[PDB]
PDB file of C-alpha atoms in Angstrom:
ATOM      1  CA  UNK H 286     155.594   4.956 147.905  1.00 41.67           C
ATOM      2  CA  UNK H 287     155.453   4.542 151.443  1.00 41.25           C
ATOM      3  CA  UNK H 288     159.354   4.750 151.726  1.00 40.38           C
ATOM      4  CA  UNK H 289     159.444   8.000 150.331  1.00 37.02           C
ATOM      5  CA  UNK H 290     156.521   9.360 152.341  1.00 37.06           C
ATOM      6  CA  UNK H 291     158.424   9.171 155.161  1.00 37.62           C
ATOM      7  CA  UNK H 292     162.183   9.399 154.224  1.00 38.80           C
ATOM      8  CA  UNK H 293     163.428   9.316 158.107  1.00 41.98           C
ATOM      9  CA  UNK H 294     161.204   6.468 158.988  1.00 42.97           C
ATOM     10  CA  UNK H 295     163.345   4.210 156.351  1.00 42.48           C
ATOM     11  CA  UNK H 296     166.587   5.869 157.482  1.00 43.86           C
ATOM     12  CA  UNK H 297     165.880   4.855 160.884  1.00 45.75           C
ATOM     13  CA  UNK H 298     165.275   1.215 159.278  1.00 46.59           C
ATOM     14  CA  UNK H 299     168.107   1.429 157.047  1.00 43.58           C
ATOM     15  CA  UNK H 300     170.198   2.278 159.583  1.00 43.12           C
ATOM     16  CA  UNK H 301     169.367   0.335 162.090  1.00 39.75           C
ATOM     17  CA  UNK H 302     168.800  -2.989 159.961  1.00 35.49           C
ATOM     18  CA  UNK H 303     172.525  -2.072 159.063  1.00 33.67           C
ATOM     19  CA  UNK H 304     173.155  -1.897 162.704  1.00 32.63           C
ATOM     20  CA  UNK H 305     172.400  -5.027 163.431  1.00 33.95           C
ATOM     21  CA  UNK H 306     174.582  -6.064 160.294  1.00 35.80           C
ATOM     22  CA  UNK H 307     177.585  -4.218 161.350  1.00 34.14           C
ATOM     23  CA  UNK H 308     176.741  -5.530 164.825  1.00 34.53           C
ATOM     24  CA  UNK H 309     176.485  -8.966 163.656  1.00 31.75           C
ATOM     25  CA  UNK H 310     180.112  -8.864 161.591  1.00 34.10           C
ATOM     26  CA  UNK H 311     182.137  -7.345 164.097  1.00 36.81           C
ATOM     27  CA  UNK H 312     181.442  -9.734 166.611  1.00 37.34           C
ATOM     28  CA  UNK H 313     183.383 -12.124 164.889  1.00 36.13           C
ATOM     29  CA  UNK H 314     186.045  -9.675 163.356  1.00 32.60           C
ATOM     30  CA  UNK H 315     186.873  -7.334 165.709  1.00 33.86           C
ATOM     31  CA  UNK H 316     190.553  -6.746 167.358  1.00 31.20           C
ATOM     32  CA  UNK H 317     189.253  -4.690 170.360  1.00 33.79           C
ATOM     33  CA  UNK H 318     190.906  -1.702 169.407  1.00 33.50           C
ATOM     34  CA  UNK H 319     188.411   1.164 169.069  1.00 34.90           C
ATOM     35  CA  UNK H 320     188.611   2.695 166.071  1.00 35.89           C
ATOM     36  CA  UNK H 321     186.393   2.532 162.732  1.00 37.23           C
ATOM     37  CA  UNK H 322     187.310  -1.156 161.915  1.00 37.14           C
ATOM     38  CA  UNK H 323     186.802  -2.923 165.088  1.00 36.70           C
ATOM     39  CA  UNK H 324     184.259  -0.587 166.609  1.00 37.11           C
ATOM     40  CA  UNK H 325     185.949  -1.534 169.873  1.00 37.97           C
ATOM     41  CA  UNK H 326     184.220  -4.607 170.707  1.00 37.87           C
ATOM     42  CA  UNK H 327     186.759  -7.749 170.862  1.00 36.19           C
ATOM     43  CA  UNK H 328     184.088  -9.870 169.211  1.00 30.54           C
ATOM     44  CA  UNK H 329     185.789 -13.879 169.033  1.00 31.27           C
ATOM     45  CA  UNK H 330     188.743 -13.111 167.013  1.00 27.98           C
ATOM     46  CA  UNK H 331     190.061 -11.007 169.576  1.00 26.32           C
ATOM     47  CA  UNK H 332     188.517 -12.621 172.247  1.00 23.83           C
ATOM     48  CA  UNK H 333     189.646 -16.526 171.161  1.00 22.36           C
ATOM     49  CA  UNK H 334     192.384 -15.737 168.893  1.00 22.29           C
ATOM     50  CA  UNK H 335     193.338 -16.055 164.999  1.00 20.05           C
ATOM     51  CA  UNK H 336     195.596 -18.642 164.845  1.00 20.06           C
ATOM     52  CA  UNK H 337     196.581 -21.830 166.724  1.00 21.22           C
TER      53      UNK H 337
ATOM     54  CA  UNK F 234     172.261   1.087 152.153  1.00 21.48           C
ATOM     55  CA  UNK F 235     173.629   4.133 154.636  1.00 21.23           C
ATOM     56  CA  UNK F 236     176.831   2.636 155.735  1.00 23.12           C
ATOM     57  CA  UNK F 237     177.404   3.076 159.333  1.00 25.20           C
ATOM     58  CA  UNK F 238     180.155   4.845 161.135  1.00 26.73           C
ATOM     59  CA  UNK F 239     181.987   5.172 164.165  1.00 30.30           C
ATOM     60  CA  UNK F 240     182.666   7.682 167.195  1.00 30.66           C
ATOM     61  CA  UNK F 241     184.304   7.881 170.442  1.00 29.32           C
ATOM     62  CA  UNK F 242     180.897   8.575 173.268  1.00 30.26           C
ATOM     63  CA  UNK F 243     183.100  11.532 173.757  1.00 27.59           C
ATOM     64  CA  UNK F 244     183.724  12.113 169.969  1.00 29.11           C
ATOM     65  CA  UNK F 245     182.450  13.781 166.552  1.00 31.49           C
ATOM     66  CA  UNK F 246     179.461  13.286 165.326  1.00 32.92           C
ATOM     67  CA  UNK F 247     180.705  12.941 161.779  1.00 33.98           C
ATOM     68  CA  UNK F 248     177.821  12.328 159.612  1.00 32.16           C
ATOM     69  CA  UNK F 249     177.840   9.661 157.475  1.00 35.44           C
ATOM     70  CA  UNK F 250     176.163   8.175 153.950  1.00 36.43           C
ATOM     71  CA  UNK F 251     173.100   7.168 153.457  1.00 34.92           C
ATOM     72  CA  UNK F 252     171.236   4.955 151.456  1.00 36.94           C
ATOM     73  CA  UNK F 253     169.765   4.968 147.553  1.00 35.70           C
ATOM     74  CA  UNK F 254     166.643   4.528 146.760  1.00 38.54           C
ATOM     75  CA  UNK F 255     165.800   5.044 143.592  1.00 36.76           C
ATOM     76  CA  UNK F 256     161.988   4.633 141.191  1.00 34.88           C
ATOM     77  CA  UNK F 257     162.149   1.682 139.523  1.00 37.83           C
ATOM     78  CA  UNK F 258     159.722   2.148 136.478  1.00 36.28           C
ATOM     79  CA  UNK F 259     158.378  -0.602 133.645  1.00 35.73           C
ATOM     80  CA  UNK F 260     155.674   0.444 131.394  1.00 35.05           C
ATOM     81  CA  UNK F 261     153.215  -1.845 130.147  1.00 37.77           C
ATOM     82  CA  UNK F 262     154.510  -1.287 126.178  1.00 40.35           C
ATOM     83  CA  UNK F 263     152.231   0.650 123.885  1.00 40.03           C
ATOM     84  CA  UNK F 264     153.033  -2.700 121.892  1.00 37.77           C
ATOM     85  CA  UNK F 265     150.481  -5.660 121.458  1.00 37.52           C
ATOM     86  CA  UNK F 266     151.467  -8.967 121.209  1.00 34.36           C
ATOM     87  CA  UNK F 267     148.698 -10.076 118.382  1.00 34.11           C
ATOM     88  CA  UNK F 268     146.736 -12.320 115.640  1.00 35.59           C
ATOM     89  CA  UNK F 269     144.528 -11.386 113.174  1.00 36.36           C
ATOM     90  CA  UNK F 270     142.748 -13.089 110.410  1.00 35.49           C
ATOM     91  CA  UNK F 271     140.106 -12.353 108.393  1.00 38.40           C
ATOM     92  CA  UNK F 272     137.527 -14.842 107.621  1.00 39.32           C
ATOM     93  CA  UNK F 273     134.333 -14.585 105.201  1.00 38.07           C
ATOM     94  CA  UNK F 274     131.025 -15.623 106.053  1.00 40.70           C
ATOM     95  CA  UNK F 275     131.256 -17.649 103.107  1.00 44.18           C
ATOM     96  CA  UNK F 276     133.792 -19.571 104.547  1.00 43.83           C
ATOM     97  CA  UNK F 277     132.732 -19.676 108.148  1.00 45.11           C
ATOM     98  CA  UNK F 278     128.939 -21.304 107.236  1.00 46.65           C
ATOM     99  CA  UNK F 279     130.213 -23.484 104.345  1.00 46.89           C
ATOM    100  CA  UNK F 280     133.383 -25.243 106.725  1.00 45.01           C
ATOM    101  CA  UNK F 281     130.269 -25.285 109.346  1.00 46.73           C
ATOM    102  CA  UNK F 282     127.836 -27.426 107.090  1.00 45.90           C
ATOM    103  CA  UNK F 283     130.057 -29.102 104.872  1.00 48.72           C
ATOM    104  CA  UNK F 284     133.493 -29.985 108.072  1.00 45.43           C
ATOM    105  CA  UNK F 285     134.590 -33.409 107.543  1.00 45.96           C
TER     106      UNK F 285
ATOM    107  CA  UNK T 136     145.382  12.816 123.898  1.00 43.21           C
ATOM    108  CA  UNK T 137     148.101  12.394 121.336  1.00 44.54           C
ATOM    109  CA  UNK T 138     149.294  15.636 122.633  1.00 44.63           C
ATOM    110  CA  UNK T 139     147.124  16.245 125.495  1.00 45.50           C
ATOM    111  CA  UNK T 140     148.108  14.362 127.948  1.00 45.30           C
ATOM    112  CA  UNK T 141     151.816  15.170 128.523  1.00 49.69           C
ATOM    113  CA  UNK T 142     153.882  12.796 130.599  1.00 49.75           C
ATOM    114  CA  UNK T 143     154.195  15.870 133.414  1.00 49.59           C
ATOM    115  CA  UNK T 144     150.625  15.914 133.700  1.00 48.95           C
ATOM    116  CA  UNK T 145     150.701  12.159 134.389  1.00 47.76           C
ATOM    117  CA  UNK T 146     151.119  11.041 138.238  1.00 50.27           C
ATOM    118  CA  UNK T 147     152.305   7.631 137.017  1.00 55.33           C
ATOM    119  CA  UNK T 148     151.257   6.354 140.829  1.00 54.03           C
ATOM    120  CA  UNK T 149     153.783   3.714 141.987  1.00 52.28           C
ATOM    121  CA  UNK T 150     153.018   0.747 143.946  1.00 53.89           C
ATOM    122  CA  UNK T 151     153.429   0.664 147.710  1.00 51.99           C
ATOM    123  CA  UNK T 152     156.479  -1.174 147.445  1.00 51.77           C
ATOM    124  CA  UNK T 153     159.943  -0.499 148.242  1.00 51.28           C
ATOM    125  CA  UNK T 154     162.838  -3.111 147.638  1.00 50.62           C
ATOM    126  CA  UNK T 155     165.371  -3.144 149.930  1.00 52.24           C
ATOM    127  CA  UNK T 156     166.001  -7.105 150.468  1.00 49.56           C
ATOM    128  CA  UNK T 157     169.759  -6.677 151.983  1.00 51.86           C
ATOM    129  CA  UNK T 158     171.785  -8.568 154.310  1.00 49.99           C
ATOM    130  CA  UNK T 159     170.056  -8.886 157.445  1.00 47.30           C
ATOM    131  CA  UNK T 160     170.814 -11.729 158.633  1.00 47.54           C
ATOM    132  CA  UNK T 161     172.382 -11.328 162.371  1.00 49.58           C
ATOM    133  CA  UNK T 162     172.596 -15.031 163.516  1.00 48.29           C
ATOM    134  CA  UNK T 163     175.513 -14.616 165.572  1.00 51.64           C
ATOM    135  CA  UNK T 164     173.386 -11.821 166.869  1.00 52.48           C
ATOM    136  CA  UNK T 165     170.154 -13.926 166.625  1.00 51.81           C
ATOM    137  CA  UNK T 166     172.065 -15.658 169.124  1.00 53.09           C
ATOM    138  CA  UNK T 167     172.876 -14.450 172.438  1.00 53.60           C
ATOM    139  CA  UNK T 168     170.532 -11.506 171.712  1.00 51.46           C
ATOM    140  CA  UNK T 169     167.343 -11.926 173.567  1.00 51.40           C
ATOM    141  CA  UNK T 170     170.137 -12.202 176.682  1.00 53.81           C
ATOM    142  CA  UNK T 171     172.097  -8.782 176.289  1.00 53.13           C
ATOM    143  CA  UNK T 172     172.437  -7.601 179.592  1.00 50.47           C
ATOM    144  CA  UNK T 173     172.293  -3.815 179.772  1.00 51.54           C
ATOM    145  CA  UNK T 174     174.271  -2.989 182.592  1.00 50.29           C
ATOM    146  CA  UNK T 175     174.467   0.694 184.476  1.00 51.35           C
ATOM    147  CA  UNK T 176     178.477   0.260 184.173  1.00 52.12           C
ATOM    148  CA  UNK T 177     180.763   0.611 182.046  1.00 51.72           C
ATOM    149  CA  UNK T 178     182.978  -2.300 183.257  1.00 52.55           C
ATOM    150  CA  UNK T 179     182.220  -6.252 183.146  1.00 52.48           C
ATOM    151  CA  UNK T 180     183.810  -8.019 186.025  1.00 52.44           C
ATOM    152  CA  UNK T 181     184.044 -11.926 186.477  1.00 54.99           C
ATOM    153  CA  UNK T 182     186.310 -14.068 188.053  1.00 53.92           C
ATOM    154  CA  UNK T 183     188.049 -17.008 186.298  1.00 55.06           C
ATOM    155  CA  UNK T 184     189.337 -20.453 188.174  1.00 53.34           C
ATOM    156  CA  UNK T 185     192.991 -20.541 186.073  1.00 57.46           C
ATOM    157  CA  UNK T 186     194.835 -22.983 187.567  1.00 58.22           C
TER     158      UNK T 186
ATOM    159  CA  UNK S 121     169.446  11.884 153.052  1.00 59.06           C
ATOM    160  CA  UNK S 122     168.490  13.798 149.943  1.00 60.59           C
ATOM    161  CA  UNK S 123     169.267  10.079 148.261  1.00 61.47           C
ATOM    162  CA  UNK S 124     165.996   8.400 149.963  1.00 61.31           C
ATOM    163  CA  UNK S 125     164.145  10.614 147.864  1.00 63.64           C
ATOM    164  CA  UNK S 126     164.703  10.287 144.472  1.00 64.53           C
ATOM    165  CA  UNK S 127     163.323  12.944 142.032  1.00 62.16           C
ATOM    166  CA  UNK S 128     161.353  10.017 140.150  1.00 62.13           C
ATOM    167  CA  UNK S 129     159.319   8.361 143.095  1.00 60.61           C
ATOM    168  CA  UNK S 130     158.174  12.364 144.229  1.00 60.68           C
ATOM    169  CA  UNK S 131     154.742  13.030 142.798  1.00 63.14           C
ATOM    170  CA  UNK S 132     154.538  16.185 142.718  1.00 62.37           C
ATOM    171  CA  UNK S 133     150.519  17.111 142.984  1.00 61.47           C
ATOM    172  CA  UNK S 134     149.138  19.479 140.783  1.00 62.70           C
ATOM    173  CA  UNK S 135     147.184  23.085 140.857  1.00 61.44           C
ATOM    174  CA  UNK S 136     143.883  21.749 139.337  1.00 61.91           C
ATOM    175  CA  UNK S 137     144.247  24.391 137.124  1.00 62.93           C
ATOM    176  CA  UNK S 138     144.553  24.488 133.278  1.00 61.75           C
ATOM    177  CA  UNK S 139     145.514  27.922 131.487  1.00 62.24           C
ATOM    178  CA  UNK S 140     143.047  27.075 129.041  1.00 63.59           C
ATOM    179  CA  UNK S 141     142.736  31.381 128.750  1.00 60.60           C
ATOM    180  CA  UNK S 142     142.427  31.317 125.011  1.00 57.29           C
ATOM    181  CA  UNK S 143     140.190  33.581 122.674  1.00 56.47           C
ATOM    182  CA  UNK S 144     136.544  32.048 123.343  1.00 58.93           C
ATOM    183  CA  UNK S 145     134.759  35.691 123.139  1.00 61.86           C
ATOM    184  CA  UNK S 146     132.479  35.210 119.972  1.00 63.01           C
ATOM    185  CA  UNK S 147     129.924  37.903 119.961  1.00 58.10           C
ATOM    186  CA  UNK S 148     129.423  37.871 116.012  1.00 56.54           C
ATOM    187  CA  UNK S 149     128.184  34.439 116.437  1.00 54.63           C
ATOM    188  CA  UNK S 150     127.062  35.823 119.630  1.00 52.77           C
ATOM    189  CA  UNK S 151     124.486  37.897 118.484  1.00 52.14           C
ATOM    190  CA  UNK S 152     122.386  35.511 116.272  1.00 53.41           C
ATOM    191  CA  UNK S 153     122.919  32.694 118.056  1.00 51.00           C
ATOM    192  CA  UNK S 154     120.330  31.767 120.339  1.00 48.00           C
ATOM    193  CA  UNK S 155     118.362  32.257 116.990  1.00 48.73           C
ATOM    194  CA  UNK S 156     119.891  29.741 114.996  1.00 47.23           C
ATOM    195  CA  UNK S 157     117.301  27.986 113.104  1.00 46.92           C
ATOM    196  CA  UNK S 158     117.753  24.188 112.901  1.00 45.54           C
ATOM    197  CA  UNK S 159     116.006  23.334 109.647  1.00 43.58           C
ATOM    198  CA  UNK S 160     115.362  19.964 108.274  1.00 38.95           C
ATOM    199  CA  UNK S 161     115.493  21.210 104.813  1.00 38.30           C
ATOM    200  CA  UNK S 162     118.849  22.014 102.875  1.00 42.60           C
ATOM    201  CA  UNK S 163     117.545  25.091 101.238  1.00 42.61           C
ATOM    202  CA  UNK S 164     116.293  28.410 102.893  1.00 41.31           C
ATOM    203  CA  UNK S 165     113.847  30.529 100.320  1.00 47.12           C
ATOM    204  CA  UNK S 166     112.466  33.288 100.615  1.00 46.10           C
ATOM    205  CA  UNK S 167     111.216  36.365  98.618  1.00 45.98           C
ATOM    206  CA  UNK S 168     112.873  39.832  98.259  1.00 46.43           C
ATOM    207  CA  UNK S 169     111.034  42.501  96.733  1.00 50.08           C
ATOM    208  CA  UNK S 170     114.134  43.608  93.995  1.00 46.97           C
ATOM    209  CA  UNK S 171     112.171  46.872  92.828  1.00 46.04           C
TER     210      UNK S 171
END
């Protein structure tokens, strides 16, 4: 198949549709720090806040 | 799907997972799904002429 | 045949389709996307009216 | 990123070669064998001078 025939032409896509997805979930959850978690973006969570 | 990672600019490169994809494969069965019946020419010209 | 044809002689070709249908998704991306300012600095400076 | 390609969906092409090398050399038949003789009759007769 045409994925297989080129195996880093669907990594890039994997990887970088999965981009966008990690991308996409941090900037809600994301504390600012920068480590593996919250990628060091701030995101709203850590931009707005948690909690009243 | 390759789950993504996270570095420092200044930090590892740290190579990461990637994806599965894997061949799916069905196989149109060696098995028919069938109906037989044997009918005589007897029957088939006498039910002709002599159908209600 | 019966016994000559053996399955690794067979290419079995696939069909030119692969199945990845994951999340993708990225509304909160979707928005505010098309606007992502790509700036030469590192730093983001703006002033805010506080009191 | 040997995982994006799985054993199954490689098709490995083939040598369009067969080692069909068996014993085909047949040179009884060989000799006397472009004169067969294709009869339409069962029965081949013929006379021998016994003495």
């Amino acid at each position: 198949i045409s994925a297989v025939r080129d195996p880093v032409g669907t990594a890039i896509a994997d990887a970088f549709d999965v981009l966008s997805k990690k991308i996409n979930s941090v900037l809600y959850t994301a504390s600012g720090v920068a480590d593996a978690t919250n990628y060091g973006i701030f995101g709203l969570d850590a931009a707005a806040g948690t909690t009243v | 799907q390759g789950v993504v990672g996270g570095r420092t600019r200044t930090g590892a490169l740290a190579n990461d997972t990637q994806g599965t994809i894997k061949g799916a494969s069905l196989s149109v069965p060696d098995y028919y799904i069938k109906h037989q019946f044997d009918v005589g020419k007897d029957e088939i010209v006498n039910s002709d002429a002599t159908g209600k | 045949l019966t016994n000559l044809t053996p399955t690794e002689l067979l290419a079995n070709k696939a069909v030119d389709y692969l199945a990845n249908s994951f999340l993708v998704e990225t509304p909160m991306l979707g928005l505010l996307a098309n606007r992502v300012i790509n700036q030469k600095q590192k730093a983001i400076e703006w002033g805010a009216k506080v009191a």
